[PDB]
Amino acid sequence: SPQYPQRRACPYRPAGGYERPVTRVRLYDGRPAWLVTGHETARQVLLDAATFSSDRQHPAFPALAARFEAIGMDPPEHTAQRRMLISGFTAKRVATLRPAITEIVDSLLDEVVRRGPGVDLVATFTLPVPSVVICRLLGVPYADHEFFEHQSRRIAAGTSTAAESADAFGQLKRYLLGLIETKGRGGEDMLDVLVDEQVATGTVTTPDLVDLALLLLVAGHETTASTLALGVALLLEQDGGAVAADPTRVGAVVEEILRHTAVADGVARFATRDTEVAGVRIAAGDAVVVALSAANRDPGPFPDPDRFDPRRGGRQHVTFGHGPHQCIGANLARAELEIALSRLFTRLPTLALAVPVEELGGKEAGGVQGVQRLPVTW
Ligand code: HEM
Ligand SMILES: [Cl-]
Ligand SMILES: [Mg+2]
Ligand SMILES: [Mg+2]
Ligand SMILES: [Mg+2]
């Protein structure tokens, strides 16, 4: 049985070779698992939320890495907590944030240009853009963006010790417990939505609201950052800068970057009951991992799956999952990726890797996939 997950040799090309639509793998600690690799079967498993549980608190729930063996919407509260958050992620709300996002993107590209050719785009642009956008989504005031960017970078850089990362988490938790006491006082940001819902229902504690805000930061930061960095590397390889600069094409270019990069490579479930997926017999308690990256390269819905093609038709990719746990932030993540890539390649059309692609350095198998650094000239 092959190991899952494996290290990406090239960080913007997922580890494939897995048989479809279902195959047997071994997790890091030897636990057997069904890996779901077909696109249709991916959707079926993610939609069948009673049979395929994401209850991380249940003892059968599979860990994909040692570091994650040792925040999240618990099952009884899930639909209520999700409905709370979704009111802060309307299409109108994201459209309203676009001007703020392009201001954040431009001020970080000012810093890229100030430093000059040789700059690491990860530390200066790809990591900071999505933490500062989450600042603006939450209502974190401009004066505190530097502190918040710095502590969220400590968690996500994947260069800090487990202790340095726990420290940074605690600082952001402290900061947000302070800030939320000032919210619901005329603002329309995510922290005001949460206060207004607590004030209206009286059944949510302020610590639970801080936990929900930290969940958004953790779900929305490294994922968006790593799909932005990998997007840039992939566009530079494909000579695709110019298409990303095109305001009519950047939406479709971003869908194709999401399909390719699938930075949340797999999501874990466990069977709560005996079932069958594509004829395969699944016992209650069995690990079931949905390989979103592999579902995204199923040659049925995505013929010529490995080619970069923004014009691609057919079914939606599952980079953001599907069904009742589908990415709440998907619309915000698209807007962010579109404005960041559009403004980067308009301002710096001659952008190029300052080292060979083979020297970018990938992240570890277990976590959000990505590069450690992205040095660039123009
Ligand atoms: C490129 C960016 C992103 C990727 C690849 C991504 C990926 C995912 C995936 C695969 C899921 C489904 C988890 C599962 O089924 O087990 C998910 C859920 C979620 N995402 Fe995202 N995401 C992105 C951006 C964001 C952003 C920007 C936010 C918030 C600001 C966010 C917040 C969440 C939340 C709260 C959930 C949980 C929803 C639930 O369980 O009901 N994500 N994301
Ligand atoms: Cl150090
Ligand atoms: Mg456990
Ligand atoms: Mg520099
Ligand atoms: Mg893929």
Side-chain angles (χ1 to χ4, degrees), residues 1-66 68-73 75-378:
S1 275
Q3 190 97 83
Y4 183 88
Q6 311 212 351
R7 200 187 168 78
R8 293 186 183 181
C10 177
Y12 52 80
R13 284 195 229 99
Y18 297 112
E19 297 245 313
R20 292 200 173 76
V22 185
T23 193
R24 159 112 306 171
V25 297
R26 217 142 262 143
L27 302 185
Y28 79 98
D29 64 350
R31 183 184 176 176
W34 305 109
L35 192 69
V36 180
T37 50
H39 174 88
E40 191 187 356
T41 69
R43 291 181 165 204
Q44 189 245 299
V45 165
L46 292 165
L47 264 163
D48 261 359
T51 294
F52 306 106
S53 177
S54 31
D55 186 354
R56 299 194 98 278
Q57 301 293 97
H58 192 284
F61 185 88
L64 302 187
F68 314 138
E69 189 69 51
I71 67 174
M73 300 179 268
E77 63 193 34
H78 175 254
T79 85
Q81 297 217 307
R82 171 176 182 93
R83 271 139 129 296
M84 215 169 294
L85 288 176
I86 279 179
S87 38
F89 285 103
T90 66
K92 187 204 161 209
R93 177 62 171 152
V94 176
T96 291
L97 283 166
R98 284 185 171 266
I101 301 175
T102 132
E103 301 179 315
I104 289 154
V105 160
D106 280 341
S107 82
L108 290 162
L109 286 169
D110 292 345
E111 175 64 11
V112 168
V113 171
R114 195 191 60 71
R115 285 172 170 262
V119 63
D120 163 39
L121 202 60
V122 163
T124 59
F125 187 61
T126 67
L127 265 177
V129 154
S131 49
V132 183
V133 169
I134 290 174
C135 281
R136 177 70 193 83
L137 168 82
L138 291 175
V140 177
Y142 181 92
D144 295 329
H145 287 185
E146 189 174 41
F147 154 83
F148 200 102
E149 190 285 313
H150 179 73
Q151 291 313 312
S152 59
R153 184 130 57 80
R154 289 179 73 221
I155 295 170
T159 209
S160 314
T161 65
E164 285 171 349
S165 200
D167 180 75
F169 190 76
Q171 298 206 40
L172 292 166
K173 184 183 321 175
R174 165 184 51 83
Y175 172 73
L176 251 20
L177 183 61
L179 185 66
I180 200 171
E181 268 159 48
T182 75
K183 295 298 175 173
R185 294 183 174 167
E188 291 187 324
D189 301 307
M190 182 62 85
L191 291 174
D192 306 302
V193 165
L194 294 172
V195 168
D196 285 347
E197 288 301 282
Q198 171 188 231
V199 164
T201 67
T203 61
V204 207
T205 198
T206 295
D208 290 335
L209 297 186
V210 174
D211 278 345
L212 286 173
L214 286 168
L215 169 59
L216 295 184
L217 167 69
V218 171
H221 181 207
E222 209 185 358
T223 47
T224 308
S226 294
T227 135
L228 182 48
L230 285 190
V232 173
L234 177 56
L235 289 169
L236 291 172
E237 160 186 277
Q238 300 295 126
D239 270 289
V243 187
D246 181 337
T248 68
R249 274 184 178 75
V250 67
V253 166
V254 158
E255 286 318 288
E256 179 73 353
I257 286 170
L258 285 159
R259 194 187 64 87
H260 267 251
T261 60
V263 107
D265 189 79
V267 293
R269 301 296 195 265
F270 66 91
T272 59
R273 48 179 283 277
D274 294 358
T275 3
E276 163 276 337
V277 174
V280 178
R281 275 282 140 184
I282 298 179
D286 282 354
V288 180
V289 180
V290 186
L292 305 174
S293 68
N296 279 0
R297 291 180 186 242
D298 186 341
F302 310 100
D304 200 24
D306 291 348
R307 202 90 39 189
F308 186 80
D309 174 23
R311 270 213 262 171
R312 218 170 260 280
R315 293 169 172 275
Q316 188 50 287
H317 65 253
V318 287
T319 294
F320 293 124
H322 181 87
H325 290 271
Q326 183 180 158
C327 195
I328 278 335
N331 50 4
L332 178 62
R334 288 179 167 113
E336 276 190 69
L337 287 175
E338 285 165 19
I339 290 164
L341 288 172
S342 142
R343 303 288 314 122
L344 174 64
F345 282 111
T346 300
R347 163 130 46 147
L348 298 180
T350 55
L351 191 71
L353 282 310
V355 307
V357 38
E358 306 96 28
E359 324 301 317
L360 284 181
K363 285 184 138 22
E364 297 299 45
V368 173
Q369 297 300 288
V371 271
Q372 281 278 351
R373 61 196 185 285
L374 201 55
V376 300
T377 7
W378 55 91

